[PDB]
Amino acid sequence: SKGPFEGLLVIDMTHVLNGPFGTQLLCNMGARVIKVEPPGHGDDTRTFGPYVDGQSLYYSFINHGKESVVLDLKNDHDKSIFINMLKQADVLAENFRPGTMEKLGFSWETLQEINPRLIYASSSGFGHTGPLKDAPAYDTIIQAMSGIMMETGYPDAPPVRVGTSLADLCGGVYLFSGIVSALYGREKSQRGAHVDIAMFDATLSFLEHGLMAYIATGKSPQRLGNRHPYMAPFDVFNTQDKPITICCGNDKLFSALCQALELTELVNDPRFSSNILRVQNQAILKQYIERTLKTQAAEVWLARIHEVGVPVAPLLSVAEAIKLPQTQARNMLIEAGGIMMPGNPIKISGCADPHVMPGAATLDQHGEQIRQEFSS
Amino acid sequence: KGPFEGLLVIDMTHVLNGPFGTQLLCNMGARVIKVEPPGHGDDTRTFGPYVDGQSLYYSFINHGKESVVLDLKNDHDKSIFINMLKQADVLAENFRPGTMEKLGFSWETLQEINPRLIYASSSGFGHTGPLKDAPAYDTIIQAMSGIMMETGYPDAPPVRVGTSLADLCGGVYLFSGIVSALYGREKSQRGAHVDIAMFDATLSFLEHGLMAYIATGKSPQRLGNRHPYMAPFDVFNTQDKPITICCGNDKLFSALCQALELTELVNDPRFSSNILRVQNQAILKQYIERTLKTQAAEVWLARIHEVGVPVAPLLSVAEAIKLPQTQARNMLIEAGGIMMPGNPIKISGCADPHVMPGAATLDQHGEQIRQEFSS
């Protein structure tokens, strides 16, 4: 089977990262996705680095399998075509600044009149409501205002961005989530709804410990770096060559670790005998640990620590991560349009998950046939 | 009150990854019955910090879920648990792979207990692959996925992202996977097995990190706060606290130079284009901060917004949740007296109240539920 959304029509006006990441998932799991791109260069990601064979890897990664037609909604003929699309469509998705779609003549209220069964999915930095709805909201801006920058990095170091476009991506997955939720709900109600996702809201929901601690203690930010707030030794540690993470969450495990490091004297040491004590005295404990670790390469410790049954792992680069046998076992690296790119992490039995997939479309590639299809 | 009204979720998930997914279902109308081990309950009940008796960690991600204790090794309970499954729409668990099977509940067995049942599992590496039975806390996943290596200032050691990203990713993927299967079932009239890996989930969030590698063979990238293709597009210090300036074209750069009284930079051959500003970003940043350090951040936010250049303060979590925008989006709700994050999925026509039912004490619904499902 080609997925649970096979037979759905998505009219996709999304661009950049936040919107298209969400719609890619719908396409991954069966839905027909027609990318409506504006005149000019089209979707902004066609002009994004990096490039392979003159073609943006950025566009390809998050638009593979999506058809492409250039439409100009300022033109009445094109507008007529777009409306015919909407009448056949289940989902209209866009991540323009709030108000953009309304000014082209497509408020949520007008959309309902066009198609009562149409799901309207919106994604933006702050959502379509609130005092900050019209404010600029790049991923970096959202990361800054959400608190995640100040929660991130070594405690004495300056605040730093998460190593990826977290706000955009959170918005994307919640966009996809909201859409499917609406599709399920529509099934009984027989009416569409407006899914309105904010990148800012999305990022707030990923704060976890940063917010919990504040609500209870009044301290903010936390800034814990690599170490766990409530367990120790549970942190990133250096070795002779390269760092590893040791996650030692209880007394039984601490004893095992000490055995493997030949630090058995620390097990009943009054500084380290219980977990709460090890958390309290984590710094001095780490000094003991890294002094022993520095005498052997990481690969030696991975063997010795794992042997005694303590959770441990190397710090890998993206390159190393995608080359792991596990990645290939999970089909998380696919080939689409002859390009290697990340796969679909949502695995559902009875749904095909091909390693080879249809590639991304060139600009207005399907424009001729699509214009014919929806002209009337 | 939401699209999932009328659904029954049997929830055996614990810690963060699994419950984050089911909390979303509960938020949007599903009846979620949390099945906890007798005595200890969900591990998060004994996670700090504590407020008025309850664990904040538990309450944040389990508010509105009913609580029953059951021992699936005990026959009387296993029988009640089975009656639950025959009426359930979804069974969710985030144990280690094989655990649910060893208790007598393979996907195969589950299928013939209730052919319509959606079985959903979240784990460190999924239920398939050579690393399926490997230890996989959030920190281990971040380390092995490449995200730690991508995170932090360029010449600084690798660092975890400031949250449990792997668990949360798997969480939302678990939720979205469940609801996808539910839509599918509405035509197929049959259940399916949703199988999410925190590792797969995290890899899908690598973005520019993985693209750049595929393109150039270099890895990691480590760019810190700086955009790879636009300048000045970075975090900058002021007299008191940092801000971010996100200036992506020449028109904006001219406007920004006006606000900072650095008009001489506009036609400077080092900064005349975006490509040149990226090449010479370091020295450009030095010029910018020398000016910025003369005024407090509030002053600069005003001056730079005035000329239409995207700018923002770096805020603590404390300041973020107090913004009027947060209140406008109902992202800080109260459940059982405790302030906590709201639901980012806003759907028109679906209720989104500020006051929600609080977390359940252990076995709180146990007597009434065990009656309800004894047969």
Residue numbers in the entry:
A (entry chain B): 6 to 381
B (entry chain A): 7 to 381
Copied sentences from the primary study:
A crystal structure of YfdE fused to an N-terminal hexahistidine tag (H6YfdE) reveals that a conserved GNxH motif replaces the glycine-rich loop previously associated with FCOCT substrate selection. The structure of H6YfdE was solved by molecular replacement using a biochemically uncharacterized protein from Brucella suis. Six subunits, forming three dimers, were placed in the asymmetric unit. Electron density for dimers AB and CD was superior to that for dimer EF, but no significant differences in the resulting models were noted. In all subunits, the N-terminal appendage and the first five to six residues were disordered. No ligands or covalent adducts were present. The monomer topology of H6YfdE closely resembles that of other class III CoA-transferase superfamily members. The large domain is formed by residues in both N-terminal and C-terminal regions of the polypeptide chain, creating a central hole through which the other subunit is threaded. (His233 from a partner subunit) is located in a GNxH motif that forms part of a loop opposite the covalent attachment point Asp173. The GNxH loop replaces the glycine-rich loop that binds oxalate in YfdW and other FCOCTs.
Insight into molecular basis for the ATR might be gained by establishing functions for YfdX, a putative membrane protein, YfdV, an unassigned membrane transport protein, and YfdE, a class III CoA-transferase that resembles YfdW. We demonstrate that these proteins have acetyl-CoA:oxalate CoA-transferase (ACOCT) activity, which allows a core metabolite to serve as an alternate source of oxalyl-CoA. The yfdXWUVE operon is regulated by EvgA and required for the oxalate-induced ATR. This study shows that YfdE is acetyl-CoA:oxalate CoA-transferase. We suggest that ACOCT is an accessory enzyme that serves to “prime” oxalate catabolism, forming oxalyl-CoA when formyl-CoA is not available.
